[PDB]
Write a protein that binds this ligand. Structure first.
Ligand SMILES: Nc1ncnc2c1ncn2[C@@H]1O[C@H](COP(=O)(O)OP(=O)(O)O)[C@@H](O)[C@H]1O
Ligand SMILES: Nc1ncnc2c1ncn2[C@@H]1O[C@H](COP(=O)(O)OP(=O)(O)O)[C@@H](O)[C@H]1O
Ligand SMILES: Nc1ncnc2c1ncn2[C@@H]1O[C@H](COP(=O)(O)OP(=O)(O)O)[C@@H](O)[C@H]1O
Ligand SMILES: [Mg+2]
Ligand SMILES: [Mg+2]
Ligand SMILES: [Mg+2]
Lengths: 370, 386, 370, 370
């Protein structure tokens, strides 16, 4: 059976092809102790990967080997892959083909080192790199539509019509969940809450996933939060302290639609989606309007689909039907679509075999993978 | 030294500003806003024909997209002006070569107003200059691109006087004098003229007041002098004070900057302070005119970070006297109207008699039939203590 | 003395008729601050035009009022023209006739507003619009030949024989230098270099103007760059970072000859020039083949003349002599030709006088200007 | 005449706008007796503020109302403000506008209570709250540069280019002089010197200001101090005892560049300044490198400017010119810049007058102050 590994910037999802849900889902972190161990004879490892690092984060410095969809520490990345195959899936990577995912418009050396590591370190019999947005369309059972995949590091839009992708219409933003987490940390200081360490960043990320939401009308929502305490919510820190946040619940997700909150000059996700559609041919814009698909964990805020529909409707012509497809399991759309593609009989000849890599080097991935 | 040396602008919060306003994009360089102590009128962009939004001052915050507007003109509206003696009567000129006078209900507009009270037709092309008579009742002045100034009796829909042989080129603006007996006008030939309408004669004229081809303004002061804004050869924006008796040389001439956009002067007779507002600029400069040289004293400048598409000045009767406010400007952005408050910082919280002299009331001194006969009367002064 | 203003999509070239070079050349950009000023008493303007915006681009959002030879922001256009007359040339436009340039097959409302602005905002005594490709033929001292003018927004070919233009044979492409800037902007991500902001686009344009060239044989040049580092060049970013580019040097200009690189369906500039010649009469094709004139900044790539000759020779019959005329000053050919045209004694009667505009409105430009 | 009050975590600097130096500089402490008075008829006060508490610290418990730039005791803060206006400056606060200083990224309620106390307790006609780092740039006569202000509670970097601040690039550290003073107390125990009381902490602070310095090479300075007594210095305690310190002279300031000495996970002041520069756009980094300004008392260590230049040079590209500006009066740069700002004619429209407070409440400070 094939292996499907979706390597996001923040979270690693792994499983077997043919399954409907990932078997191993854990954070994509590597933690190392920043203090001195004084207990002799108890098992201190040099580093912790995944859930163990998350549970021991009090005495660790958490590092993300993937930043903005680009691996910045390949030694740390091998640890995560080694943990995935041997500790999470508990399989031998040399016996199963591996299907990996990558964001579009990535550096070409990123997927070449991915090819070299898979074939030389893990000795995978076959390997393939797929675009995350393309895989999301597989999970929805569609051949036409524009997918706005937004995870922890990358927010990209890939429009596809009748099984054909438009590479010139692909747009990529470096604004994602991690930037929202950092923005939430900055605005939480307005209420006196100070989070600075890498471990405290994980606490704020948990706050963001539990209390944040997207406001249908940001200006009206700000007025409501400034006149009453109905929108205030409470969160309990691991040490027992209780924090309360008000307008920060919808201000942090608002940076997706207003990147100027972070000092970025780029357009919001609604305009990026609209611009990608407008870059396509006129005859296919109607189908893309009614088949807008959301993917990734960043699009999991309550009310994000209603806001996206409202924003694009104001931009698109009034005669087009704007339909935002936001399945309840869209956090795993990339993996589920990868599971479907890896099980297709017509996909078995698209694998990059060991023989092909041996006679062409790591550069073979640019010829066989889109 | 003056009390007006310390005047600073404080914009109100967003909840008192007026948002969601499709401000009209007409290239014509008018104020684009008329405000009285009762309503706020803003020229808006209409899909067909022309319309301007009239709303009560209380209706702040977001403005309804389908809010009824005054849509009666078949072309976009160029300028608007509230009647000084009636807060519920407004005049408007558009490119449909006609002037329409409207009657706004006390509570505002519930349905889109389309039928005007009177329709004045005396022009062959677009009318961009509308000026109510300061004293005579129901007397209105209209000036269009046809280089003719017409006096309208809105009460009887009658054209009292016609003057077409006075301007050989495009007219920029027309400003009535103190008592309403004369009016100044700036023409495209760089000439400033003082015209008596009741006699059809040219009282005074100054050719080449400014040496710039850019548009120039000219307004009448309370003491009878003319304040003009213009450009030089190198587009250097200038201010000049002219005595009608002596027009060979200006009393003062000061250069501001080398930016584009005509300077629209806002002059307050009670304070003798002119507020220089330039179209497209983000700053408002105020100067004090006195009898001491150089007769134009720069006080200060209110600065902002947003260019303004229009500007409206609220008269004395609608100002917050108890807060030492002597001017209120409704800055027009592309999609928002932001009132800006001119204030004089005073330690005392009591009434300032020196800051608020007697101002012209909403009661007309004369009527249209008496003004024709040559009768003149100064505006009826009221008190602001109450 | 008449004024010659060549308002291209990227650059504004202005000067006096009778001169041999423009007196003022500055970028056609208008920049506005995107941050908040915190220092009081400093002369911070609301917007910056031309060189000042280029020098302060680190804190500005740069906007081009012209997109594809069409003015999209007329308010920003009056800023540039005001900057040209009063700050660069330091002349009063109401005392000099102004000769303007426009690309063929432009919207009719584009040149009507130019006529209205010149007469009503600047009060020019006389005014005229000339086709850019026609002016380039004046600079070369020719009356017969086809001019391939390629600037920042528009690439167009205008064939002229014995002083007579063939309007039916005029071809226009919306592929120009700005599209190449965006293409190099996209393909620089393959090496990990990330440029996103409008200020960073100006840096990418500077890289293109200094390191890019046209390969005589694209496929052979691909092999050479993939086998050695002889084609690699280094460029130092404003912050001191050094970047190295390889095959991207000649892949970016290749989009002119292979528009499919940008997803466009149109043919290359070599085929567009040949198609314009083929649309002409048979008896004049021989003269057009030997008098092919290049103009505009997009034809300043090294080796573009050799590549164009090689491509047109393959299309034209073997018995025709293909001669590509590429003068070293072809970046200012449009202005130089306008300088020559405005100084002719026979041209003084074709000015659109103020009295003509007054009695006919802005529509007079459609009767007096080709 | 306006009043400029720079309230840092450790020291309170007050004076009049237009002067070149503060008129009153006293410690920001409030002391209360911890014993029982037995002398009847003696002028014993309930509490002592400023120099009076410092002189009587033997029998007092010194408390700092400001901790890390955040006021933790507003009742004690009013005493210091009352002592400042009536005992130090000897003026009526209701007759002069007051300009206050605050560190960036502070809790929003901190500056709201400052607004409320100034208007309701002291009845100031006007007030304004300014960022400390922005004021330091005023004192140096620059409109471009990055200022690393390090005082007693907060170390923060604010980059400014052409008068425009980059809020997204502002970094703040909770490591400052007070943390170094506590670190010096901890490491002084290695030589048998014990300082535990609040009075003894002030003694250690005096030792730090007199004998501590920044070593150019920390590891090399370790070898020198462990091989000879050339670096050893002597200090006399108030009771006559003489203590001698060796490597502790440069170990305490080293915690600024190596925060791991204190168990902190944050980066050093050299990396924080570099990281703030890297968060800015590429076109302005070159100007920020050559205009690095040091401010605050924590930057008064001998050799800190040389060390900062050496550390930043290693991080910055070799082609950049690293210039560290360290004026000899940088301990009062925040106040001096505030004096200049409060005297500007263009600043007179930025005051928050008494009128706005009555019609807006304490929330006015968030819409009229940066
Ligand atoms: N319920 C939620 N609400 C808001 N954000 C979420 C939620 N769940 C996950 N996220 C964000 O999505 C990011 C990762 O999402 P995902 O795409 O599933 O993984 P990856 O991006 O690592 O592939 C995380 O950084 C997290 O902050
Ligand atoms: N030496 C060069 N090499 C390649 N491209 C150039 C060069 N010089 C200018 N260009 C390109 O030419 C474009 C503008 O050329 P030009 O025709 O002179 O101005 P405009 O197109 O604005 O009239 C710019 O976008 C620039 O990218
Ligand atoms: N000469 C010096 N050497 C080292 N540190 C100093 C020196 N002078 C002052 N400091 C430190 O600076 C801190 C406060 O400095 P400053 O910024 O001027 O005041 P504040 O931080 O209260 O605004 C004090 O904690 C003190 O330890
Ligand atoms: Mg993902
Ligand atoms: Mg050109
Ligand atoms: Mg300080």
């Amino acid at each position: 059976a094939a292996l499907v590994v979706d390597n996001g910037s923040g979270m690693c999802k792994a499983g077997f092809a043919g399954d409907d849900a990932p078997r191993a889902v854990f954070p994509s972190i590597v933690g190392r102790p920043r203090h001195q161990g004084v207990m002799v004879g108890m098992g201190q490892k040099d580093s912790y990967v995944g859930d163990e690092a998350q549970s021991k984060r009090g005495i660790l410095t958490l590092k993300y080997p993937i930043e903005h969809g680009i691996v910045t520490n390949w030694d740390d990345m091998e640890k995560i892959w080694h943990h995935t195959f041997y500790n999470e899936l508990r399989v031998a990577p040399e016996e199963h083909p591996v299907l990996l995912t990558e964001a579009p418009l990535n550096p070409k050396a990123n997927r070449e080192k991915m090819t070299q590591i898979m074939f030389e370190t893990f000795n995978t019999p076959a390997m393939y790199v797929a675009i995350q947005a393309v895989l999301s369309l597989y999970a929805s059972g569609r051949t036409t539509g524009i997918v706005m995949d937004s995870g922890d590091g990358v927010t990209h839009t890939v429009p596809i019509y009748e099984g054909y992708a438009l590479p010139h219409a692909i747009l990529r933003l470096d604004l994602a969940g991690r930037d929202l987490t950092d923005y939430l940390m900055k605005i939480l200081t307005e209420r006196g809450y100070s989070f600075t360490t890498t471990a405290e960043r994980e606490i704020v990320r948990d706050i963001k996933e539990k209390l944040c939401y997207v406001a249908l009308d940001f200006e009206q929502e700000m007025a409501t939060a400034a006149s009453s305490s109905s929108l205030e919510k409470s969160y309990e820190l691991p040490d027992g302290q209780v924090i309360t946040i008000g307008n920060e619940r919808f201000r942090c997700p608002e940076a997706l639609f207003q990147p100027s909150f972070l000092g970025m000059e780029s357009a919001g996700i609604h305009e990026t989606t609209f611009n990608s559609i407008m870059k396509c041919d006129v005859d296919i814009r109607k189908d893309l309007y009614a088949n807008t698909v959301l993917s990734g964990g960043t699009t999991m805020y309550p009310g994000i689909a209603d806001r996206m529909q409202k924003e694009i409707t104001a931009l698109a012509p009034s005669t087009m039907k704007i339909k935002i497809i936001a399945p309840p399991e869209r956090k795993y759309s990339v993996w589920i679509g990868g599971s479907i593609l890896a099980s297709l009989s017509t996909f078995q000849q698209m694998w990059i075999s060991k023989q092909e890599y041996d006679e062409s080097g790591p550069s073979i991935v640019h010829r066989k993978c889109f | 030294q003056s009390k007006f040396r310390h005047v600073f602008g404080q914009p109100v919060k967003n909840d008192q500003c007026y948002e969601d306003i499709r401000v009209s994009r007409v290239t014509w360089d008018s104020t684009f806003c008329a405000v009285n102590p009762k309503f706020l009128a803003v020229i808006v962009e209409a899909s067909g024909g022309g319309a301007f939004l009239v709303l009560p001052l209380s209706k702040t915050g977001r403005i309804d997209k389908a809010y009824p507007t005054v849509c009666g003109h078949t072309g976009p509206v160029l300028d608007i002006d509230w009647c000084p003696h009636n807060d519920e009567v407004i005049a408007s000129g558009s490119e449909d070569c006609t002037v329409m006078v409207w009657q706004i209900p006390e509570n505002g507009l519930t349905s889109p107003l389309t039928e005007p009270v009177v329709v004045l037709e005396g022009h062959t092309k677009r009318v961009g200059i509308i000026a109510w008579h300061p004293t005579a009742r129901n007397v209105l002045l209209s000036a269009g691109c046809d280089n003719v100034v017409l006096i309208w009796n809105v009460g009887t829909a009658e054209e009292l006087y016609r003057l077409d042989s006075l301007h050989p080129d495009l007219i920029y603006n027309v400003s009535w004098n103190h008592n309403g007996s004369l009016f100044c006008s700036a023409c495209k030939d760089k000439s400033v003229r003082i015209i008596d309408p009741r006699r059809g004669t040219l009282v005074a004229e100054r050719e080449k007041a400014h040496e710039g081809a850019r548009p120039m303004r000219a307004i009448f002061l309370a003491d009878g002098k003319v304040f003009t804004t213009g450009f030089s050869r190198m587009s250097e924006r200038q201010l000049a004070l002219w005595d009608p008796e002596n027009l060979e040389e200006p009393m003062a001439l000061q250069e501001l900057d080398s930016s584009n956009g005509a300077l629209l002067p806002f002059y307050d007779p009670d304070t003798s302070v002119v507020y220089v507002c330039g179209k497209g600029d983000s700053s408002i400069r105020y100067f004090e005119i006195t009898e001491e040289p150089p007769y134009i004293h720069f006080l200060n400048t209110f600065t902002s970070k947003e260019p303004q598409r229009g500007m409206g000045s609220m008269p004395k009767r609608g100002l917050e006297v108890s807060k030492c406010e002597i001017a209120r400007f409704y800055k027009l952005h592309e999609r928002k109207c932001e009132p800006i408050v001119m204030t004089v910082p005073r330690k005392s919280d009591l009434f300032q008699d020196d800051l608020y002299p007697d101002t012209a009331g909403p009661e007309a001194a004369l009527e249209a039939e008496e003004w024709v006969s040559g009768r003149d009367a100064d505006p009826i002064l009221i008190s602001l203590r109450e």
